[PDB]
Amino acid sequence: DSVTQTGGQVALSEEDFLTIHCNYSASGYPALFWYVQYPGEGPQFLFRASRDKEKGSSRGFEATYNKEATSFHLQKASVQESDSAVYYCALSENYGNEKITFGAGTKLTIKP
């Protein structure tokens, strides 16, 4: 499968509205994910969604499984200080390959 993150870098100022795109191509119902990676550490689970129309969320972020538009855009109304890191959109093939395909990631730099 494949995952596309149309945004490589995203610059925003405190409390700005955040949206990081995620479009994909899969071979069936996969489970969509979002991982966050802060400076110096490994990627960590943010949240997931198994069924279409379902919404995953955590720490203020959220995405909605839109199987029709094959998207799972991450959103957070007001980005804080600690949000600045790298976000990866991923699709887990828990029901098939059990392989997790990741996007290219998106670095979020939040200025005061």
Add this chain to the structure above:
Amino acid sequence: AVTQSPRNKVAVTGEKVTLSCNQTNNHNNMYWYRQDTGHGLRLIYYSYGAGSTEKGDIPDGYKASRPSQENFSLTLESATPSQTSVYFCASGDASGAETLYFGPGTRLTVL
């Protein structure tokens, strides 16, 4: 939960490098990824369970070993400059749609 070693490594072209991964929750699945700008995270090798190994999307130049359930290692037989990236190991939690938990990672630089 999942620990990797070494955290920092510099090799010379041709050096044989082994990256070690240890999980503590006994999941059957373990994965080795490298993270590169413009590519994010790509699977090199992964393991369905103890004693078995499976090629990922970009296995060339690597080999892995899963002697046990808790340990999965990645080896670069003869390091090349292109292998210069950050390697992340992870175990798969089946109860959460295979939600992964990565180790801190190994920053490898090939001189």
